[PDB]
Structures are given as C-alpha cells and as structure tokens.
Amino acid sequence: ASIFRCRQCGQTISRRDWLLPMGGDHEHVVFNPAGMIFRVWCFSLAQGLRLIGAPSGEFSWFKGYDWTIALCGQCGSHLGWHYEGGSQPQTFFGLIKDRLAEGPA
Ligand SMILES: [Zn+2]
Fold first, then answer.
1. 42: nearest Cα among 31, 30, 26, 29
2. Ligand 1 center to residue 78 CA distance, Å?
3. 30 CA to middle of ligand 1, Å?
4. If phi over 0 gives left and psi between -120 and 50 gives alpha, with beta otherwise, what is residue 104?
5. Annotated binding residue 25
6. Nearest alpha carbon to residue 94 among 73, 65, 53
7. Cα of 23 to ligand 1 centre, how many Å?
8. Which pairs from 35-42 meet CB under 8 Å and 24+ separation?
9. What are the Cα distances from residue 28, in Å, to 8, 56, 82?
C-alpha cells in the first residue's frame, strides 16, 4: 500500500509517503457549485497528470490557493486539482481519493 495509481487505467500518480496534512488533516471533504461532494486527499507531489488551462481562485477550497483541473495524463479521468499561488506550501495537489487505486510499489 505504497503507491497510488489512476483507478481507470493504471497510470502512476502518487505515493502514500507524499501525503500532506493541510490545516492538520490530509483529508478534506468539499463540494463544488454543482453540489458534487469530493473526498480530497492532499499530496505534496504527484506525477502522470495533465494540468488543464490556467489557474483560478474562484471557489477555491484552500485559502490563498488558485487551482487548475488535474486529469490523468493517460486516460483523461478527472483526478483532482493542482493548487498554486499560496504559502507554506506554495503548491500542492488535491486528489479525489476514490478515483485512485492503492497498491505495491
Ligand atoms: Zn487514468
């Protein structure tokens, strides 16, 4: 239970070692304006994503951060967001827990 992959295709995405307790918890449950609930796990680092467009602060769930949609770079599945423009840390990833599969390195 050491690396996280895209559930839909297997792409390598992150690692348990890279979980980041933001505001004291690595897990944050949030909703967008369309009412969709997301169980977000914060990671300091991720790979294999494709970050879409330019950042936006609108509706940001993390104070001081602007976001970009993060797709699986391989299959296009929406895996979460990349956050930037903030402080301590400047950047991080918020990934949707149930869209990842955990398993051995
Ligand atoms: Zn994928």
1. 26
2. 8
3. 22
4. beta
5. yes
6. 65
7. 29
8. 38/80, 38/96, 39/96, 39/97, 39/98, 40/80, 40/94, 40/95, 40/96, 40/97, 41/94, 41/95, 41/96, 41/97, 41/100, 42/92, 42/93, 42/94, 42/95
9. 22, 19, 15
